Amino acid sequence: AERVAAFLKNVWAKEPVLVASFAIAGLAVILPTLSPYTKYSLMINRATPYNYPVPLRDDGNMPDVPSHPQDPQGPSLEWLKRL
Amino acid sequence: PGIVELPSLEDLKVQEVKVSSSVLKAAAHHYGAQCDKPNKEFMLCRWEEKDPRRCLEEGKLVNQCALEFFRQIKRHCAEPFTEYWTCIDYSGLQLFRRCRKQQAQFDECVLDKL
Amino acid sequence: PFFDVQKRLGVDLDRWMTIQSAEQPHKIPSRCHAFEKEWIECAHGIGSIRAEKECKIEFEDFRECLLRQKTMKRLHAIRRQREKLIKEGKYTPPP
Amino acid sequence: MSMVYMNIMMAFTVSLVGLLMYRSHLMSSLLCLEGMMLSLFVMAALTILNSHFTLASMMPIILLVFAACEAALGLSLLVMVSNTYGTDYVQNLNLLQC
Amino acid sequence: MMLYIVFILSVIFVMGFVGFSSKPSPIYGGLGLIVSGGVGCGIVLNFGGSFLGLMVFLIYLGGMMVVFGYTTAMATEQYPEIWLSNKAVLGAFVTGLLMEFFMVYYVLKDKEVEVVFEFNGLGDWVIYDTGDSGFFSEEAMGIAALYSYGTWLVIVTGWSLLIGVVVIMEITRG
Amino acid sequence: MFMINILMLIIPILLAVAFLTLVERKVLGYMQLRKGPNVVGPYGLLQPIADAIKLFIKEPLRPATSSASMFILAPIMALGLALTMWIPLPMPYPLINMNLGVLFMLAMSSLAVYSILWSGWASNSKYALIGALRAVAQTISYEVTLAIILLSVLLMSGSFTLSTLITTQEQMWLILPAWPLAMMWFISTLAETNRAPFDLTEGESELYAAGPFALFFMAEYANIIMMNIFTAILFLGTSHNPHMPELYTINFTIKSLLLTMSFLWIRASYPRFRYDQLMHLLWKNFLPLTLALCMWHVSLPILTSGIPPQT
Amino acid sequence: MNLMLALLTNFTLATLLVIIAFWLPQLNVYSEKGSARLPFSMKFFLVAITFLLFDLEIALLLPLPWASQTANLNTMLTMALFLIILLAVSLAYEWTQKGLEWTE
Amino acid sequence: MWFEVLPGIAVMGVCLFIPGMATARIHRFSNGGKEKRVAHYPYQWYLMERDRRVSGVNRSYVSKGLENI
Amino acid sequence: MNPIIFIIILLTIMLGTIIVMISSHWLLVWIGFEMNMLAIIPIMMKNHNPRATEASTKYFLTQSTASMLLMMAVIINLMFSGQWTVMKLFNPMASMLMTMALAMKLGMAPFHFWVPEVTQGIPLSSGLILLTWQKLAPMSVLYQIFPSINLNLILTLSVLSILIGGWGGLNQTQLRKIMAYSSIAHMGWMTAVLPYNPTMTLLNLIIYIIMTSTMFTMFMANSTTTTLSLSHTWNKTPIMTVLILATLLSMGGLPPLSGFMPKWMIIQEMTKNNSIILPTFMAITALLNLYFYMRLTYSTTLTMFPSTNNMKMKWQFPLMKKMTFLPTMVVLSTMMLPLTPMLSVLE
Ligand SMILES: CCCCCCCCCCCCCCCCCC(=O)OC[C@H](COP(=O)(O)OCCN)OC(=O)CCCCCCCCCCCCCCCCC
Ligand SMILES: CCCCCCCCCCCCO[C@@H]1O[C@H](CO)[C@@H](O[C@H]2O[C@H](CO)[C@@H](O)[C@H](O)[C@H]2O)[C@H](O)[C@H]1O
Ligand SMILES: CCCCCCCCCCCCO[C@@H]1O[C@H](CO)[C@@H](O[C@H]2O[C@H](CO)[C@@H](O)[C@H](O)[C@H]2O)[C@H](O)[C@H]1O
Ligand SMILES: CCCCCCCCCCCCO[C@@H]1O[C@H](CO)[C@@H](O[C@H]2O[C@H](CO)[C@@H](O)[C@H](O)[C@H]2O)[C@H](O)[C@H]1O
Ligand SMILES: CCCCCCCCCCCCO[C@@H]1O[C@H](CO)[C@@H](O[C@H]2O[C@H](CO)[C@@H](O)[C@H](O)[C@H]2O)[C@H](O)[C@H]1O
Ligand SMILES: CCCCCCCCCCCCO[C@@H]1O[C@H](CO)[C@@H](O[C@H]2O[C@H](CO)[C@@H](O)[C@H](O)[C@H]2O)[C@H](O)[C@H]1O
Ligand SMILES: N=C(N)NC(=N)NCCc1ccc(I)c(Cl)c1
Ligand SMILES: N=C(N)NC(=N)NCCc1ccc(I)c(Cl)c1
């Protein structure tokens, strides 16, 4: 804890450019795993509709599939409007 | 090999929706909601059949719904709509976000009148 | 593969890019998707000795989509005939 | 096949003959080797783009990257040959005759 | 016609190859390859490959060919020999151009030619796709997939580049 | 109508370069407690004209070159590529609207090193060839950081289109989230354009003539202006009002002018780097930081949920 | 067509300025007044070769703005950092092996 | 005095102002008074080509509204 | 070379080979060859002398040319089948190009000229890798594409290699050149049987590698690279002379030694296919190899050549070289014939 602290002070005095590089690279590797917002990047990427949403033939037993886009079934982007 | 069977030139005739892309963009959101049922039936046909010759009749109904949809706008909200798509048309990218004042007028007109 | 390590471990190292009818980003299909799908399904599991004969029809169609040699030849035939008639005045193209 | 393929394959053949028919400079032969890579890159890119083979769109990049690394190794050998003899002439590389 | 732009570019492509493949002074041979690279990028551009076209310029011409010229100036040729001064180079150069011209003339006269193999001469546009209306570049989608689909490709490619650095430092230490 | 547009880009570029020679001399003069040109025309406004005419009617002393074709090629490549760098610039509308405009500028700029190399070959003198190779080594070295810094910025923009940088900076200049990259980007452009304290081609030869000299100079100063226009777009994005595009053009021009003046300011203020020292500034300082900031700028939009749109 | 015209104009004008810069009236009536190892350090070779290898790595990082639009972000972020870290390891290797030195 | 540097700067600034101003006004002149259409992607090009046919004069920038319904 | 770097470079030579062997995609096969060629060059160059630089350059030019031809074959195959799977090719011109490329990589005649020269110009340990590990990847591709190879082409390459290898070795006094021509001859047997039974190709490859590794290891043990230098072994390490004798006779295909087994099995498979002239011609031509193997036994083991006085100083020191696996390899190189039915594990 101290010998490492005495090590950091030496590199901070001698090679501040390298200390900053390694510090930033560590944060780039670590912070994504800690951030609570990282999960939203996945959802937003999946919510972007690049191609046509081909409708399903209705066989009479799909109560979770909306019949109309303005029906209440299917994924909602209310979470995204607030974000 | 066989002869590629094609429909007749007259079997392909239908009234065309001859409005520009900015007009379609301005009406796109209401058009999607209003004409969904015939539109989805046509797209289901195209993806199941994988043949444009097999869904021509479904494609004629898509046109008819679009025409009746634009005839309703013309009857009731011709002026707010004209101001709105004319604002879309100015933009080189046809951006929605530059025309929110005019969109609100058009949106408020269709809600009251239709 | 000489040593089929991928199938032994169930890990996909390069199979994903071997054929154009595999899964693509955003479901973008290749131009000859249906032809490659048909040929692959015809020849699946029967071995290449059998497939070379029993799936010749699907493979010839797939090859035609790939390089369009027979289509270009047909277009070349119709164009060449049209030049003759234009060179002989027996044909005037419509508008 | 398509008309463009006639000339792309011709370019590869021309560079292959250039590669197999040495003159004196090793660098001139290394340029022919890169010529073959460039024609391969074009032929691959045309085939992949025209067929809409989407995931194969990265393959020409990988070809370019690996072949440039190959060329860097080739250049490094050329300078070492030039340091030894003062030129990059292939005729100097005949010690292993015996 | 501009309907034959791809074919015309490929004609120049070949002429550039006959240029450096006849192997004049490595300085002029390098110029022939640079011209071919640019013409080759144009061919790729006209097939819808904008990124792939610009990679040839960025990496092949601005990267590899710069290092070739740099190395040539150092360890090969410092002053060019007069172009086509050697008879062997001139004979090879003329022979390739004569072959090329015959292919071009015959394929243009008959709109097809059989040089070993049979080719069509109607123009390259005939094979193009007729139904594109997506809101993205498909070439861009494919290349971007290197990071989702191509984990294995990234690993071996990145490893080879690192080894290239280590290797070239070993070769040149002497 | 499009050819009119091309000329209305080329001619003002060349005129702006001419009068940058005047501005550089007068700004340097006043920072040196003197005046600079103020006799040839009022406030020296005719000085660029006198210099241009003088240079072109000067004897074109070219020693018997080892390559006539490469002697002519180098100035044509330099000037031709310099003007090409301007055609995708949105001001606010580009002459050519390229989807991959940023990538086009990177690819064209990487070709500009051939004019240095070819002019070295054509000089027919191993001393000038060695000077050319040292300049090429400096230029390609700093191309590494420019490309990586540019990539890091685009991870917040979302595309390679130059006009999308305008949209990205509608609320805030990119210099605020990315001032560490702006710092290294700015210094890299100085070294890229062989500007002091990185003007080691001029210093080392101390320790071309007439029109052909003038053409290389014009290409150099066109590149200097273009680099600073690029910096303003990249980091100091001006807001665009589609109904008043000239307000964008006024504000964006002022920022580019000021950035260009800062090039002259820096030239007046510092001594010159040694060659090995500007090589260490790149490989041992900028590149480690640029790599680390490149890692950070890949992670940051993902971890903040701030990934920009593709379109 | 526009880009071709712009390019043709830019280099045609550059060509015209260069030739006229060479051939202007002079008003005089009298007679006017090789492939070896250049003595250049191996260090300069290694810079160019080092630039090339880093440039090839940059080519692989260029697709990153598009790759960040994937739903497979976990894989994409891991591979981006892997490539950049390997680039850093390359620099660390040249640095610690005195490949970046200009003495000797 | 320092402000005698301004005339050279002003000439430089006007020179840099013309390119951007000229392009903007030329685009409006050639596109019916609007911004030049941007088509980076096939979808945008498809709609622009459809506009050209719908216009009736082969001009993608000539718009047709409800009057054609 | 730093020992850690040497290890990493060696691991990359192996990884390039393994990528070729596990790949199902032609692009990854091509990458494996490129990675492998990148890592091999430094070990050819490691002794820094003009001969090593010439050898590495000749190697680079040959292998880079072959890899471009392979890429061309892959791309032609892509145009005519729209896929990259490693298997039979779907175009005869692609098949020829890939076969010629793999022949150049293997150093088969008439693409053989580089093998004797490169092997001569590099150290023994590097030559051991070149003539053993480096054959694995190209052979593993031939193993997979053989259903589409042109029979006349592959058998012409095989016949030429056996002839050139046998004749070329007759005129050599350098040990590294002898092994090179021996390698060319043995590649001929491997490919001759490939169209009929690829399992016998693997059997001949494995036994070839074991015997070749044994010879190189015994040459390294005594630091011998010439025939005369090897002829001093009897006065320093008599046991080594006997092991060399057994290994050389085995490499000559003499029963009851191990090296007879591949020739025996290959002749059997060819005759089952009514190929009688070719096996007989092959077996007789391989007597040329036996001749210059026997010459080495004469000067190494069966006679005692003159010595030098300084050799006595060597009597006072023990062998310190690693000779890794030498006891195991020499036994396999000579005493495996009774276990011939074990070849079925290679199926
Ligand atoms: C099992 C089924 C498979 C059947 C296949 C046949 C198997 C046989 C092949 C096995 C592999 C060869 C192994 C031979 C081991 C040799 C050990 C030996 O015999 O002694 C060597 C002898 C020792 O000499 P030294 O080191 O000085 O120690 C004693 C002090 N004077 O060194 C000397 O003194 C030098 C002797 C002079 C040279 C005489 C050579 C003739 C004897 C050859 C014996 C080996 C046979 C090789 C050929 C195979 C024969 C079938
Ligand atoms: C926090 C993790 C973030 C991810 C970082 C990305 C990977 C970067 C890898 C860089 C590895 C460099 O590793 C580096 O090696 C050398 C070993 O000679 C060490 O440096 C050592 O040698 C130098 C001489 O060159 C000595 O002066 C110094 O006293 C000694 O420390 C560095 O202290 C170490 O940092
Ligand atoms: C020399 C070798 C160098 C190798 C360097 C590799 C470093 C990799 C570091 C980042 C890896 C993990 O990075 C990040 O971690 C979090 C875990 O909380 C993942 O998980 C996060 O995103 C996913 C989306 O897929 C969400 O469903 C999840 O709820 C969220 O926690 C992220 O998908 C990933 O982007
Ligand atoms: C010398 C160094 C050796 C290092 C060896 C390291 C081996 C690394 C193997 C990486 C591949 C792991 O296994 C493979 O990974 C990727 C991403 O994780 C997965 O792929 C995933 O991303 C894309 C997204 O479309 C697709 O491939 C697929 O839809 C999805 O499953 C594969 O389904 C999985 O089979
Ligand atoms: C930018 C457009 C400007 C348009 C101006 C048009 C003016 C045309 C008249 C040009 C006058 C040039 O004037 C002339 O230039 C040349 C430059 O080589 C000078 O030099 C020339 O003459 C001297 C001897 O007198 C020679 O030794 C020399 O080799 C020769 O080049 C002349 O000494 C000078 O008299
Ligand atoms: C060593 C020089 C290397 C230069 C390589 C130059 C590129 C080579 C181009 C190969 C592509 C053409 O390859 C060739 O195409 C034609 C049809 O297109 C094939 O087809 C041809 O032969 C078969 C015979 O049964 C039939 O299809 C038909 O009679 C004929 O068209 C050939 O079987 C194939 O060999
Ligand atoms: N470095 C300075 N600013 N002074 C200076 N020596 N300028 C050079 C003068 C010059 C060169 C080309 C042209 I065209 C013009 Cl018009 C003027
Ligand atoms: N390709 C060939 N000509 N030969 C071949 N492999 N035939 C297959 C017959 C066979 C023979 C031995 C075994 I053990 C097994 Cl399992 C199968």
Residue tagged 């077996």 (tokens): I283
Q: Cβ neighbours of residue I283 under 8 Å, at least 6 residues apart?
A: I263, I267
- Which residues, other chains included, contact F288 with Cβ-Cβ below 8 Å and sequence gap of 6+? A17, A18, A21, G88, G91
How many Cα atoms are found within 13 Å in the side-chain-facing hemisphere of H48?
15
| Number of C-beta neighbours around residue G42 at 10 A | 16
Ligand 3 pocket residues where CB is under 6 Å: A 29, 32-33, 38-39, 42; F 302; G 73-74, 77-78, 81-82, 85
Closest C-alpha among D35, F113, F78 to residue E40: D35
CA distance H2 to F102: 37
SS3 state of residue A1: coil
Bridge partners, residue I174, by sequence: I226
CATH of segment(s) D3-85: 1.10.287.3510
Phi, psi (degrees; rounded to nearest 5) at I277: -65, -50
Q: Which of F179, F284, F296 to mutate to test the interface with A (most CBs of A within 10 A)?
A: F296
Q: Residue F165 corresponds to which amino acid?
A: L
Distance CA B13, CA B7 (A): 11
Number of helices and strands in chain D (H, E): 3, 0
- The Cα F161–Cα F249 span in angstroms is 19
How many Å apart are CA C83 and CA D83, to the nearest integer?
Answer: 65
Half-sphere exposure of F105 (CA within 13 A, CB side): 27
Q: Any idea of the CA torsion for F294, F300, F302, F305, to the nearest 10 degrees?
A: -150
Q: Which protein residue has the closest C-alpha to ligand 4 atom 17? A: G75
I344 lines ligand 8 (CB under 6 A): yes
**C-alpha–C-alpha distance, residues F18 and F34, integer Å:** 21
Breaks (C-N over 2.5 A) in chain F follow: 207
For residue F28, give Cα distances in angstroms to E36, E118, F20, F174, I33.
45, 69, 12, 30, 59
Contact (CB, 8 A) for D63 and I31? no
Question: Ligand 2 pocket check: which of G96, G98, G101 to mutate, most ligand atoms within 8 Å of Cβ?
Answer: G96
At position G24, the amino acid (one-letter code) is L
Instruction: Select from F15, F53, F57 the residue to mutate for testing ligand 5; criterion: most ligand atoms less than 8 Å from CB.
Output: F57
Half-sphere exposure in the Cβ direction for G3 (13 Å, CA)? 11
Report the helix count and the strand count for chain G, using DSSP H and E: 4, 0
Q: Collect all residues with Cβ–Cβ distance below 8 Å to D68 and sequence separation of at least 6.
A: E59, E60, E63, E64, G52, G56
Q: How far apart are the first and last CA of chain F?
A: 29
d(CA A67, CA B4): 37
d(CA D28, CA E21) in angstroms, rounded, equals 8
In this structure, the residue with its CA closest to atom 35 of ligand 5 is G27
| Chain E residues 120-149 with a CB less than 8 Å from chain A | 134-136
Residue type, F40: V
Distance, C-alpha I20 to centroid of its chain: 18
> Residue C27: its chain A contacts at CB < 8 A?
51
Q: How would you label I209-222 residue by residue, b for 16+ Cβ within 10 Å and e otherwise?
A: bbbbbbbbbbbbbb
Dist CA C77 CA E105 (whole Å): 20
Of how many residues is chain H composed?
A: 69
Q: Which residues pair with I226 in a beta bridge?
A: I174
Nearest ligand, CA G73: 3
Burial of C47 (0-12, 13-18, 19+ CB in 10 A): exposed
Answer for the pair D51, E53: CB distance below 8 angstroms, yes or no: no
Three-state DSSP at E78 gives coil
CA–CA dist I242, I235 (Å, integer): 12
Instruction: For Cα atoms C82, C88, C90, give the angle at the middle one, nearest 5 degrees.
Output: 70
Residues of chain D neighbouring I117 (CB-CB closer than 8 A): 96-97
Q: Tokens in use for I203? A: 């059997």
Do F136 and E54 lie within an 8 Å CB cutoff? no
Tell me, yes or no, if C27 comes closer than 8 A to chain D by beta carbon.
no
Amino acid identity of residue I285, one-letter, is T
Q: Is-contact I14 E159, C-beta < 8 A?
A: no
d(CA F159, CA F168): 10
Rounded CA gap, B22 and F80, in Å?
Answer: 39
Cα C3-C8-C13 angle, rounded to 5 deg: 75
Other Cβ atoms within 10 Å of F49 Cβ, number: 14
User: Between D12, D53, D59, which is nearest I27 by CB?
Assistant: D59
d(CA I284, CA I166): 11
Contact state of C4 with I88 under an 8 Å Cβ cutoff: no
Give, as one character, the DSSP assignment of residue E155.
H
Atom of ligand 4 nearest to the CA of C13: 11
Q: Cα–Cα distance between I97 and I110 in angstroms, integer?
A: 15
User: What does the DSSP 8-state code read for residue C17?
Assistant: G
Q: How many CA atoms lie within 13 A of D81 on its CB side?
A: 27
Question: In this structure, what token pair is assigned to residue I12?
Answer: 């990359």
Query: With contact defined as beta carbons under 8 Å apart, do I240 and I222 qualify?
Result: yes
> In Å, how far are B18, H44, H53, H61, I232 from H47, measured between CA atoms?
12, 5, 10, 11, 87
CA angle E167, G78, I23 (to 5 degrees): 60
CA gap C78, C74 in Å, rounded: 6
Size of interface D-E (CB pairs under 8 A): 220
Which backbone phi and psi does C19 adopt, to 5 degrees? -135, 155
**What six digits make up the tokens of G82?**
């892997």
Q: Give the position of tokens 């104009």.
A: G9
C-alpha–C-alpha distance, residues I69 and I219, integer Å: 36
Contact at CB, C48 and I147, closer than 8 angstroms: yes
What is the distance between the alpha carbons of residues I167 and F309, in angstroms, rounded to a whole number?
Answer: 69
Largest CA distance in chain G: 78
Which residue from I242, I297, I332 has its CB within 8 A of the most atoms of ligand 1, so it is best to mutate? I242
DSSP assignment string, I26-95: HHHHHHHHHHHHHHHHHHHHTT-SHHHHHHHHHHHHHHHHHHHHHHHHHHHHHHHHSB-BSSS-S-HHHH
Give the count of Cβ contacts less than 8 A between chain F and H: 105
CB F285 within 8 A of CB H60: no
* Radius of gyration of chain G measured on its C-alpha atoms: 25
Residue I180 contacts residue I131 (beta carbons within 8 Å): yes
- B residues 60..89 contacting H (CB < 8 A): 67, 70-71, 73-74, 78, 81-82, 85-86, 89
**Can you give the three-state secondary structure of A12-56, one letter per residue?**
HHHCHHHHHHHHHHHHHHHHHHHCCCHHHHHHHHHHCCCCCCCCC
What distance in Å separates the CA atoms of residue A41 and residue F304, rounded to the nearest whole number? 8
What is the rounded distance in angstroms from the CA atom of residue F118 to the CA atom of residue F96? Answer: 29
Q: Any residues with CB less than 8 A from the CB of C36 and at least 6 apart, and which?
A: C19, C20, C21, C30, C62, I82, I83
Token look-up 């590389």 returns D93
Please state the separation of Cα I286 from the chain's center in Å.
16
- Round to whole Å and give the CA distance between G70 and G72: 5
Please give the CATH number for the structural domain made up of G7-96: 1.20.58.1610
Residues of F in contact with H20 (CB under 8 A): 91-93, 245-246, 248-249, 252-253
The Å distance, Cα I97 to ligand 6 centre, comes to 12
Q: How many other C-beta atoms can be found within 10 angstroms of the C-beta atom of residue F170?
A: 9
Instruction: Measure the CA–CA gap between G38 and G43, rounded to whole angstroms.
Output: 13
Where is E46: in which H helix or E strand? Answer: none
Q: Count Cα neighbours of A55 within 13 Å in the Cβ-side half-sphere.
A: 18
Supply the residue whose CA is at minimum distance from atom 33 of ligand 4: C12
The verdict on domain E4-169 having CATH code 3.20.20.60 is: no
Q: Which amino acid, one-letter code, is at E72? A: T
Cα separation, I305 vs I301, in Å, equals 9
Q: How far apart are CA C93 and CA C79, in angstroms?
A: 12
* Chain centroid, CA B1 distance in Å: 39
* CA–CA gap between residue C2 and residue I24 (Å, rounded): 9
Mutual orientation of helices F210-235 and G2-22 as an angle, nearest 10°? 150
Write a three-state SS string for chain F: CHHHHHHHHHHHHHHHHHHHHHHHHHHHHHHCCCCCCCCCCHHHCCHHHHHHHHHHCCCCCCCCCCCHHHHHHHHHHHHHHHHHCCCCCCCCCCCCCCCCHHHHHHHHHHHCHHHHHHHHHHCCCHHHHHHHHHHHHHHHHHHHHHHHHHHHHHHHHCCCCHHHHHHHCCCCCCCCCCHHHHHHHHHHHHHHCCCCCCCHHHHHHHCCCHHHHHHHHHHHHHHHHHHHHHHHHHHCCCCCCCCCHHHHHHHHHHHHHHHHHHHHHHHCCCCCCCHHHHHHHHHHHHHHHHHHHHHHHHHHHHHHCCCCCCC
What is the atom index within ligand 1 of the atom nearest the CA of I335? 3
Residue A66 in tokens: 């909306």
In DSSP notation, B49-63 reads H--GGGGHHHHHHHH
How is residue E5 written in tokens? Answer: 């732009």
CA atoms within 13 A on the CB side of D11: 32
Q: What is the largest CA-CA distance in chain C?
A: 71
Experimental technique of record: cryo-EM
CA distance C17 to C30: 12
Beta-carbon count within 10 A of C29 CB: 13
Q: One-letter amino acid identity for F244?
A: M
Q: Are I119 and I242 in contact (CB under 8 A)?
A: no
Q: Is E90 exposed, middle or buried (0-12, 13-18, 19+ CB in 10 A)?
A: middle
Cα separation, C69 vs C61, whole angstroms: 11
Residues with Cβ within 8 Å of E157's Cβ and at least 6 positions away in sequence, in order, are D62, D65, D66, G60, I31
Element (H, E) at E120: strand E117-120
Interface test with F, best of H17, H27, H36 (most F CBs within 10 A): H17
D vs B contact (3+ beta-carbon pairs below 8 A): no
Which residues have C-beta within 8 Å of that of residue F227, sequence separation ≥ 6? Answer: F189, F192, F193
The dihedral built from the CA positions of residue I218, I219, I223 and I227, taken in this order, carries a sign that is: positive
How many angstroms separate the first and last alpha carbons of chain C? 58
Do G14 and F215 count as a contact with CB atoms less than 8 A apart? yes
Tell which residue, D97, I195, F288, E162, has the closest CA to residue G90: E162
Domain count, chain H: 1
Helices A38-47 and F287-304: crossing angle in degrees, nearest 10, is 70
Which residue intervals of chain I are DSSP H helices? Answer: 3-22, 26-45, 50-81, 92-106, 114-120, 124-131, 133-145, 151-169, 175-193, 198-222, 227-230, 238-251, 260-272, 277-285, 287-297, 311-314, 326-334
Distances (CA, A) of I36 to I41, I71, I135, I136: 9, 16, 12, 11
Q: Is the peptide bond before F92 cis (omega within 30 degrees of 0)?
A: yes
**Within 10 Å of residue D91's Cβ, how many Cβ atoms?**
9
I25: helix, strand or coil: strand
- Inter-chain residue contact H19 with F9, CB threshold 8 Å: yes
Domain ranges of chain G: 7-96
